[model samples]
Target: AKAPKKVEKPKLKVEDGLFGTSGGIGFTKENELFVGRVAMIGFAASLLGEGITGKGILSQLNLETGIPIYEAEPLLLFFILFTLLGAIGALGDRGRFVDEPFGFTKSNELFVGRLAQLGFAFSLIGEIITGKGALAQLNIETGVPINEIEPLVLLNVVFFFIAAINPGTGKFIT
Candidate 1:
């Protein structure tokens, strides 16, 4: 009898993994898009909920005008749910930045990108808490009126721009 022919698997190319001509530049384009879409949807719903409930961003920091902690339970729940979804998605993917299907050594741009995001989130929270109390206390104790610190808002804008322009993470924006 003639010998049976053997099937061969396709060889992986470096370009396919590192510089593929996919919709996006990375190997995990699908996964990134999927997670990003989910996040955007969650953000949109969160914003819509806030608008419908009349809880404006500034109001959230006003303490008296803000909704009670219990009132935020729903939004908080959504946040956790979305975050978990993203994490699960990540678990399924293979990448260093986006999980590579195979092992490769390279810079992790995504990590820097995520840090920028976290920095901005924390910055907003810090501004809210400081403006409401710490700023006032500093003004009283150090003889520096709150108005003198108005320029500080500009600094926040600068930092935000820097974060948004991060070379590693900024590809999403540009």
Candidate 2:
């Protein structure tokens, strides 16, 4: 004499941390690599600009190589295009994050790029705290061999092997 179980339908419960399915869109390994590249580019460009023109990163927006960063249309168009294309790229990427090689794919440059990402962040904080143009801090005048140059070069050399050693079986995207 057992109680009747409702066999018509089965309801299952979901139990897991929210935002916790391994990772998501921008958190994927490939996605993070792309972000890292952009940050590296930003760090390089800002430091270059400040070094060359003696202009702070904040000031250059209105002065040199300055585009209408505040305007909407062109920026929106780029976002639309990226939205269309980035998804396609991710489809090929399959949003994968396995600790393996993707071969000239997004994750290949990640290690080196991650350093650049941090460089930009550190630059911003460094400027904020020190209250000096980033170039001035570097003492680029006649090569004082200060904080601006060789760290990234050595780091680039360092991470190249780190990025290369990740190749593993089944991680190759066929």
lDDT of 1 at 57: 35
Q: How many residue pairs of model 2 clash at the backbone?
A: 0
- The alpha-carbon RMSD values of the candidates against the true structure, listed in the order shown, are 11.4, 10.7
Clashing pairs in 2: none
lDDT of each: 0.37, 0.47
Across residues 1-174, which tens digit of lDDT does each residue of candidate 1 receive?
998998888954333332333233442533544444344333333233333443433345343322343444455435444444333333233333332332211223233233333333332233344432223333455676556643453344344344333333212211
**TM-score for candidate 1, residues paired by index:** 0.33
Q: Each model's TM-score? A: 0.33, 0.45
Q: Write the per-residue lDDT of candidate 2 for residues 1-174, one digit (tens) a residue.
A: 999886777653322112333232234444545555565566666666665676766456542222333332454335434433332343223344344422554454654555655555544444544544456555543365545564654454345434534432333221
Q: Where in model 1 is the C-alpha error above 4 Å?
A: 1-65, 80-94, 97-116, 119-153, 169-174
